């Protein structure tokens, strides 16, 4: 009798949610942006190519100075590059070569990485000794670590394959907050620009908006039919975009609690590995499995699709804070800066 | 360039030569995925080949597209003990029908040969798998299990499934992996020559 009542209550809660969704939508974004100037063509060019290796390049990250770049590769290397002069500032060997993510601290003193070892490793860049030393090894996740993002030089937020996100203090070494509610493996995070909220995407074809200082799931977004691989905030912090294995990007709003845009195409069925916005929106840059990056108009249909130079699939892509450059890392062991 | 800029370029070149030295050292190594917290890495060496076995046990399979080979281990005696053979063949279908794993060889170890020989004299296969339609002898049932595993491969023209039987008082169980890795290296060399 308890299971039937629970199923009835869940069904009526979902039906009330859907009824709230239906009255919330009256006009789509395509009906509003049908009378604005379309962005014609973006002709990006590879300005710099950061090379020298053979192992495939997993996730990268930018600096807040828009100058230094960090990249993690399958050869157990974390390389910190100077993008203006192509010089490698730092080379950091990793204990585990199966790294899936990397982050660069907003202050610039720390880098982080993690992967199949279930540890978030924090490395100090500014030491009197002269070399990069491991500050901390955050342990506690029971699955592979898929994304990590710094809030400051004290706290970090991580997502893992145990359907769980975590907020850690990087001096004590303990999980300050544990975010639960996903049923599949969460593999993407995006921190808000004010660092009060974050959003995550899991194997359950769902995205969740979490409150950092309150420790609870504010919103749940049910869009895609497949695994959500990438997620990214809009610059204003009121919307986000998701890329999935169904060859479809989707733009959701936090306040409207609904999906607005569906960026789809009828030429490839390749999944999305990475998404990022530009400084003002208007350019959703999505990397695919077809060795290419497509540039979508965030308020319309496809615009450029021009980032064509990559021998293998674009595993990662990022946009600088000043918006000058877009760096893409692919599995051909090559980082390319595009402008 | 300024003075500090040239010194920074010199530092970058030193990092370049260190990275190249590490790459030349790691070019010998062979990565194998063992199927059958975190990873369990076991490193050994055979005939100037450094083998790294990563004991790990559809979402973590996207981090292993560059492995040399997959060592799939099956204990036969689980036919006599939810059937484990059905889960094994479902896993083998999952590891063979992947779109990104269409050219990765599999070394199929079939252990518990003596236990299966002892259990096949008293317990026939008709209590578990009565559709095989064959004898109850050791060799015929072993060949039936091997061909039942091998028939699950679809489009056997790019990769090859290597079936070996476990042995104790010898070192041929490493020599089989050495031969399979040598064939994989030969195919990769023809790929690098632009001739295959």
């Amino acid at each position, epitope marked *: 009798s308890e299971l039937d009542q629970l199923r009835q209550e869940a069904e009526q809660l979902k039906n009330q949610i859907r009824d709230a969704r239906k009255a919330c939508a009256d006009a789509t974004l395509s009906q509003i942006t049908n009378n604005i100037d379309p962005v014609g063509r973006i002709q990006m060019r590879t300005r710099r190519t950061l090379r020298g290796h053979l192992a495939k390049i997993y996730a990268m990250h930018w600096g807040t100075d828009s100058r230094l770049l960090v990249s993690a590769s399958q050869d157990g290397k974390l390389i910190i590059w*100077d993008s203006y002069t192509t010089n490698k*500032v730092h080379a950091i060997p990793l204990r585990s070569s199966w790294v899936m993510t990397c982050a660069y601290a907003p202050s610039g003193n720390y880098v982080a990485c993690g992967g199949l070892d279930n540890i978030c490793s924090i490395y100090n860049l500014k030491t009197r*000794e002269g070399n990069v030393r491991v500050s901390r090894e955050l342990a506690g996740h029971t699955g592979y670590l898929s994304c990590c993002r710094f809030l400051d030089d004290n706290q970090i937020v991580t997502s893992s394959g145990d359907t769980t996100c975590a907020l850690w203090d990087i001096e004590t070494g303990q999980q300050t907050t544990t975010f639960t509610g996903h049923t599949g493996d969460v593999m993407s995070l995006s921190l808000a620009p004010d660092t009060r909220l974050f959003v995550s995407g899991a194997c359950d074809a769902s995205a969740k908006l979490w409150d950092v200082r309150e420790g609870m799931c504010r919103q749940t977004f049910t869009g895609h039919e497949s695994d959500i691989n990438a997620i990214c905030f809009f610059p204003n912090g009121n919307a986000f975009a998701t890329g999935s294995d169904d060859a479809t990007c989707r733009l959701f709003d936090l306040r409207a609690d609904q999906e607005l845009m569906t960026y789809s195409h009828d030429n490839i069925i390749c999944g999305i590995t990475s998404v990022s916005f530009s400084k003002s929106g208007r350019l959703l840059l999505a990397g695919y499995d077809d060795f290419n990056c497509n540039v979508w108009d965030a308020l319309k249909a496809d615009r450029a699709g021009v980032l064509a130079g990559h021998d293998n699939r674009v595993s990662c892509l990022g946009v600088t804070d000043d918006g000058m450059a877009v760096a893409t890392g692919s599995w051909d062991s090559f980082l390319k800066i595009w402008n | 360039l300024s003075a*500090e800029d040239k010194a920074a370029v010199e*530092r970058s070149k*030193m990092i370049d030569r260190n990275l190249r030295e590490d790459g030349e050292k790691a070019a010998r190594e062979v990565k194998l995925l063992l199927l059958g917290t975190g990873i369990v890495e076991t490193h050994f060496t055979f005939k100037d080949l450094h083998f790294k076995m990563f004991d790990v046990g559809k979402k973590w399979i996207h981090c292993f597209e560059g492995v040399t080979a997959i060592i799939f281990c099956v204990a036969l005696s689980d036919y006599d003990l939810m059937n484990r053979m059905h889960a094994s063949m479902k896993l083998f279908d999952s590891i063979c029908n992947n779109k990104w794993f269409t050219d990765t060889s599999i070394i199929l170890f079939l252990n518990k040969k003596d236990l299966f020989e002892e259990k096949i004299k008293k317990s026939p296969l008709t209590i578990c798998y009565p559709e095989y339609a064959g004898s109850n002898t050791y060799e015929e049932a072993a060949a039936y299990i091997q061909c039942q595993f091998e028939d699950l491969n679809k489009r056997k023209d790019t990769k090859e499934i290597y079936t070996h039987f476990t042995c104790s008082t010898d070192t041929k169980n490493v020599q089989f992996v050495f031969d399979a890795v040598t064939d994989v290296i030969i195919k990769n060399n023809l790929k690098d020559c632009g001739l295959f």
Partner: single-chain antibody
Amino acid sequence: VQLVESGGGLVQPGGSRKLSCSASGFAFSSFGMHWVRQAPEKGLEWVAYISSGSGTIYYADTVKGRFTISRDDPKNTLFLQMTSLRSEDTAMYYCVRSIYYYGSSPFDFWGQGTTLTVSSSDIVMTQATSSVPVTPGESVSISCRSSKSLLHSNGNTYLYWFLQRPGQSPQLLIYRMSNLASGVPDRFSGSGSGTAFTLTISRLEAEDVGVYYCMQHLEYPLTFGAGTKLEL
């Protein structure tokens, strides 16, 4: 975190000696290293530089052809072999570590110094002020001038502010202007452009007395100025 000098002593003119410096507490092989003199009553002058990995070795024109700077990385040692010594070479020698990448802090640590006595183009860095009397609690400005502009096309202005307390090694305060070195209190500030350069101290304390030096790093014969003395 330690550079201990050795050698020194009294040497006859026309002789040779072998200054050594032992480095500890830091990754020695990643650092370029410098030898800098100080005359018994005068300012600092650069002598020699060896790069990390010994790729680049640069000398001063005074000591060129007579001095040889080398390093033994696995035993963490710097060497200066001085042949054909002169009465101008009576001085106290300092060994300085120097790191070079984007955002680095070169000339950050200085050794104690070793003294030897020998018995009986370039950018000119000018400090027109010296022997400035001062009381604690007052803002102090120290000026420095350069013969040519120290602003590169990179947007970097390579001028360095060091302080030498009485009976102490020079300590790096400013490496590029408005980049305060590690461990330095936030009352020292650096400003200027091109030729003109200024170091200001807001709330002066009693530990800030001593001689202040400005050095350029734009060109390889690194040049100092006759420093400004701040006394109570």
